[PDB]
Ligand binder design. Structure first.
Ligand SMILES: [Ca+2]
Ligand SMILES: [K+]
Ligand SMILES: [Zn+2]
Lengths: 117, 618, 341
DNA sequence: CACAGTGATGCAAATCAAGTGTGAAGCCAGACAAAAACC
DNA sequence: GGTTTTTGTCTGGCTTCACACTTGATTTGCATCACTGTGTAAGACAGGCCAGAT
DNA sequence: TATCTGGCCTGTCTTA
């Protein structure tokens, strides 16, 4: 974005308010009123010259039951938490290293007929 | 800056133009509708649309606020493919274009339709025969089988000049029944019977067979096949159940001669006249069929095992093919009837009083008499004794009448009477060939002027349908001087049109009871008219079909209840599908044409697939 | 050995592969028509005479006491010495194999028209199952006459036969069959020398011995280059059959055999391989105890015969063969030649 | 160097479906000011 | 220039969403194969033959 | 007499 003179004015006012009132949560609709009154010929010149610098910056910027691996994975999730993408890497390695997966595939075999029907 | 159109503006820009109306809307919602700006704008928009008669946009927005997904189940896509005659290659073009323009996969891709086909084709459903079928494999996953059935083809053997594909008969029947299951259940229900009732159902199957000419041979390597085909088909005609001491009509085919229900069983490229190749290919089909007469098919329908007994009726055969396969002589012979032993001369003198005596069983005996000559007779006496049965039958047919070819032959005959009544042959016996040609030319030109018929080389069903009317006799009378013969022609056609409905309607008893009642009476006066006022043509001779039509129509009607429904016209209509499917629904190569057409022709005949196209007509 | 083209009459369609020719006193006759007999010729048997390279097929009639045998393809045919012909097995137009046997004999020859007698011969004992592509010959031993029958093919037996392979064919067991026509009984012999089944071979019969040449074995699918001698002894007691292999045998199936002179025959035609026709011809010289097979000069075949995949023929009798090759199709289906010796 | 198919095959490519918390994008609020078109 | 309308910026936190990997299995996309049909009647010109013309 | 154009016939050639 590119910032107008009035906009730089508003940002500086917000900074002053935050340093004066650290524990204070500003309301938006009241702040625009008081800021607009402050804006409404010498105070503004600083902000006016600041705005063109911002313009230059803008130029630079312009240019189905689960797979047996899933069933195994889900149960081993808590242990890994005790030890997502990282968890899945660990799950896959240990599953690959493991008759070990015959029971999980049997559960999947019961589930496959149920999916089909 | 002239105000742009509202739709062009960016979100920020349209907000500023409507912020005045937006705040006004927030009031109305808090005041009247509980602060539901969403629901009050949705309703105002939907109502703005229908106000401008734009219901489709409103209705779709409704379906997308509800959010329900749109897609067609594969078996429904299949039905749309099969029944609108789209090819997979063409359907693929539609599917691809729909998915890319709507971003949604409304139609399914071809691999899933190809999977939905599997249910509908023979070999998918399990079954068993008690007792097991003789000489038939009990395997139940047999789909398309080679039609040569292991025919020897080594260069020593007889030369194999045909390609053929088929279904195993039983395996096909099973797939037909499973296709009909919903119509069998609904048929019990409407007869107030138990859905789960499983008693001995009985299936009556119409069997049809036909040769085609003008089947072009493809280029490319293969057997040098002849340019003809043969088709064996069956139509499921009715199913009754035995509930008490009643036979309850669970199902009867509404449209018995439609291509929709003539199911293909055997496609071969071969000549019906070539007996050696014909028996080689169809003998396996007949042996499967003989076995099924002696067994009961137990098959699982809706969770409950059911038993089916089968009756096979071969009636979809033209006379020429019937004579060929039941060892009879060719249609020129003196033994004109395939239903009785009468002689061409006898049929002209008596005309009407002849009963059905021939049968597949009798013909088999007579061939054996022919072959063995047990009274050591002369060939004349031998032939007289077996009444022309001098070859061994190989296919069992019902002794009946094909209404299609009957309708055609008879019209072809009348067309000839018309010519000879124009040359006044009743009065002048001798006429030159040139003098005869002009009689036909006169009548041809006149049928064009008065009836809008163009001349055709070979007689047509629709021509016959249109020619055999009293209005056409009117036309023809404008060319005959003598009104004594206007009378004769009018009567002859009145009698014929009193007779025709009997042998063409599905249920003469319900549809033309008085025509059925009077048939024996009407056929007598028809016969007498030919004998007296048409002596020149019908003294000492009669056409095969005039005989069949005058002498056997009533007995057939009481033995079977109908003639028209057992006609070939449905299987003939199937040929039209053969030609179309060979061009537009098959791989175009000699070693896949027959099977691709057979499988896709079966799908076209599936009632489960047809039902999806009457969904609109709930 | 001159090759000669032949023209044919209106009923050229009758002639098909598997047809048979029989010789009665120099008059040739034709049997085994395509399709069932028609009202033009009810017997299916034709006077087959070639006059100036034009062949006319004319119908012949049967005697009152005759059977009307069906047209048969690839039956075993034999000549019996009073001259008569034996037909055993073969295919009917309905593709059935007939187990029957028929005898063809001249009944009457008034005014150069022949009436035939066709009688069925009943056969009991060890009857050979219905067959085609098999040889049958008559041997003479010790003033006694005996019929020999060997090889061929049939369909699977009813127990194993299935509709899906309804037409599948297998070689018959290679049992030599003695068949005495006088009594109507048949005796079977199993021999160690004859282990494989064999069909479409040539059979030559001299005195008490029959030579088996070439043929094709379905299980092996080989056209073996073997010669088998089979001697039959007819003593007062039960006859004995002894077989001998004799190397130097021709390798050919479906070959045609003609007799040029007493004791010398020519073997022409047939197939060396499924796709290779046998263009050479062999000469057989017979000795009371010896058989001689000699290479002879090949005939001047035309480019049609050379490039045909299939050819079929039968022996006319006076050392002349009637050959046929598949012809152009719209015209006539087959092209016929006559080869003289 | 005609050309748009004709259906089944089989291999590549996409997709699925589960676990949760990152950041990114759009949005609201009042008031005022860039740009970009017209008298 | 004066005037009219499109597009914003200023802020904190609201939601919704896509993404983050891995594994095995489905589901889609796509090229491949040898072959299809639409090309599909009548006039020009020569040379032999014999009757009626020269 | 002794030829002699013309139709007539068939059959091939060229394009469809
Ligand atoms: Ca037909
Ligand atoms: K129709
Ligand atoms: Zn009759």
């Amino acid at each position: 974005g590119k910032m107008s003179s009035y906009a730089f004015f508003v940002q500086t006012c917000r900074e002053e308010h935050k340093k004066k009132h650290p524990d204070a949560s500003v309301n938006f609709s009241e702040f625009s009123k008081k800021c607009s009154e402050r804006w409404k010929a010498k105070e503004k010149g600083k902000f006016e010259d600041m705005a063109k610098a911002d313009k230059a910056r803008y130029e630079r910027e312009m240019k189905r039951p689960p797979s047996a691996f899933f069933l195994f994975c889900s149960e081993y999730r808590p242990k890994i938490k005790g030890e997502i993408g990282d968890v899945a890497k660990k799950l896959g390695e240990m599953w690959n290293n493991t008759d070990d997966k015959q029971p999980y595939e049997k559960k999947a075999a019961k589930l496959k007929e149920k999916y089909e029907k | 800056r002239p105000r742009q159109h509202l739709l062009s503006l960016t979100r920020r820009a349209q907000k500023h133009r409507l912020r005045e109306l937006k705040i006004q809307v927030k009031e109305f919602a808090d005041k009247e509708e509980g602060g539901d700006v969403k629901a009050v704008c949705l309703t105002l928009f939907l109502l703005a649309l229908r106000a401008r008669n734009e219901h489709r946009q409103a209705d779709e927005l409704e379906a997308i606020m509800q959010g329900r997904g749109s897609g067609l189940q594969p078996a429904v896509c299949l039905a749309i493919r099969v029944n609108t005659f789209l090819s997979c290659s063409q359907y693929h073009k539609m599917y691809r274009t729909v998915k890319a323009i709507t971003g949604r996969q409304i139609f399914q891709p071809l691999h899933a339709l190809r999977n939905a086909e599997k249910v509908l084709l023979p070999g998918y459903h399990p079954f068993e025969w008690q007792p097991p079928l003789k000489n038939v494999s009990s395997r139940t996953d047999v789909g398309i089988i080679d039609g040569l059935s292991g025919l020897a083809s080594s260069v020593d053997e007889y030369p194999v000049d045909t390609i053929a594909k088929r279904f195993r008969y039983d395996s096909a029947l099973v797939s037909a029944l499973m296709d009909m299951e919903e119509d069998i259940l609904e048929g019990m229900r409407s007869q107030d019977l138990d859905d789960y009732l499983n008693g001995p159902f009985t299936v009556v199957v119409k069997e049809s067979c036909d040769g085609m000419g003008d089947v072009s041979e493809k280029h490319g390597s293969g057997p040098a096949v002849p340019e003809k085909a043969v088709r064996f088909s069956f139509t499921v005609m009715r199913i009754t159940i035995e509930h008490g001491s009643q036979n309850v009509k669970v199902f009867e085919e509404p449209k018995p001669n439609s291509e929709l229900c003539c199911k293909p069983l055997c496609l071969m490229l071969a000549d019906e006249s070539d007996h050696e190749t014909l028996t080689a290919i169809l003998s396996p089909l007949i042996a499967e069929r003989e076995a099924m007469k002696s067994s009961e098919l137990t098959l699982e329908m809706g969770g409950i095992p059911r038993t089916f007994k089968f009756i096979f009726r071969g009636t979809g055969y033209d006379e020429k093919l019937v004579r060929e396969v039941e060892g009879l002589e060719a249609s020129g012979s003196v033994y004109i009837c395939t239903l009785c032993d009468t002689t061409r001369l006898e049929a002209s003198q008596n005309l009407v009083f002849h009963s059905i005596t021939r049968s597949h069983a009798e013909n088999l005996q007579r061939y054996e008499v022919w072959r063995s000559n047990p009274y050591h007779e002369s060939v004349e006496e031998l032939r007289d004794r077996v009444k022309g049965v001098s070859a061994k039958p190989f296919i069992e047919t019902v002794p009946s009448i094909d209404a299609l070819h009957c309708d055609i032959g008879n019209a072809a005959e009348f067309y000839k009477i018309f010519q000879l009544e124009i040359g006044e042959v009743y009065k002048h016996p001798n006429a030159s060939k040139e003098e005869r040609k002009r009689w036909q030319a006169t009548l041809d030109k006149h049928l064009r002027k008065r009836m809008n018929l163009k001349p055709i080389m070979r007689m047509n069903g629709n021509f016959a349908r249109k020619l055999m009317t009293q209005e056409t006799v009117d036309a023809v009378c404008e060319l005959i001087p003598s009104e004594e013969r206007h009378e004769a022609l009018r009567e002859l056609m009145d009698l014929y049109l009193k007779m025709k409905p009997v042998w063409r309607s599905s249920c003469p008893a319900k549809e033309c009871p008085e025509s059925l009642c009077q048939y024996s009476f009407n056929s007598q006066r028809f016969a007498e008219l030919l004998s007296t006022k048409f002596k020149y043509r019908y003294e000492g001779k009669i056409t095969n079909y005039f005989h069949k039509t005058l002498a056997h129509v009533p007995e057939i009607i009481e033995r079977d209840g109908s003639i028209g429904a057992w006609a070939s016209e449905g299987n003939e209509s199937g040929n039209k599908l053969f030609r179309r499917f060979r061009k537009m629904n098959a791989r175009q190569s000699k070693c896949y044409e027959m099977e691709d057409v057979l499988k896709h022709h079966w799908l076209y005949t599936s009632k489960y697939l047809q039902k999806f196209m009457n969904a609109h007509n709930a | 050995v001159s090759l000669q083209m032949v023209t044919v009459g209106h009923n050229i369609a009758l002639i098909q592969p598997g047809f048979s020719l029989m010789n009665f006193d120099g008059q040739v006759f034709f049997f085994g028509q395509k399709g069932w007999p028609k009202r033009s010729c009810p017997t299916g048997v034709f006077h087959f005479d070639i006059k100036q390279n034009h062949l006319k097929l004319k119908p012949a009639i049967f005697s009152k006491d005759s059977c009307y045998l069906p047209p048969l393809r690839y039956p075993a045919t034999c000549s019996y010495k009073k001259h008569q012909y034996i037909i055993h097995g073969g295919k009917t137009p309905n593709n059935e194999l007939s187990d029957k046997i028929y005898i063809m004999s001249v009944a009457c020859k008034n005014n150069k028209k022949v009436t035939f007698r066709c009688t069925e011969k009943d056969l009991v004992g060890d009857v050979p199952e219905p067959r085609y592509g098999h040889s049958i010959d008559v041997v003479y031993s010790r003033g006694k006459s005996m019929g020999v029958l060997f090889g061929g093919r049939s369909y699977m037996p009813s127990t194993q036969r299935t509709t899906e392979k309804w037409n599948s064919v297998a070689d018959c067991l290679p049992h030599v069959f003695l068949i005495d026509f006088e009594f109507g009984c048949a005796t079977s012999y199993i021999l160690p020398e004859l282990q494989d089944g064999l069909s479409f071979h040539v059979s030559i019969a001299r005195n008490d011995t029959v030579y088996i040449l070439g043929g094709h074995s379905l299980a092996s699918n080989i056209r073996p280059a073997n010669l088998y001698r089979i001697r039959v002894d007819l003593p007062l007691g039960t006859p004995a059959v002894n077989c001998t292999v004799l190397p130097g045998g021709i390798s050919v199936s479906s070959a045609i055999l003609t007799q040029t002179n007493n004791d010398e025959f020519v073997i022409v035609g047939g197939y060396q391989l499924e796709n290779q026709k046998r263009m050479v011809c062999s000469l057989v010289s017979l000795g009371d105890n010896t058989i001689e097979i000699s290479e002879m000069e090949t005939p001047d075949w035309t480019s049609d015969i050379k490039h045909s995949k299939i050819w079929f023929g039968s022996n006319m009798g006076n050392g002349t063969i009637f050959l046929g090759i598949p012809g152009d199709n719209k015209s006539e289906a087959f092209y016929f030649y006559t080869l003289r010796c």
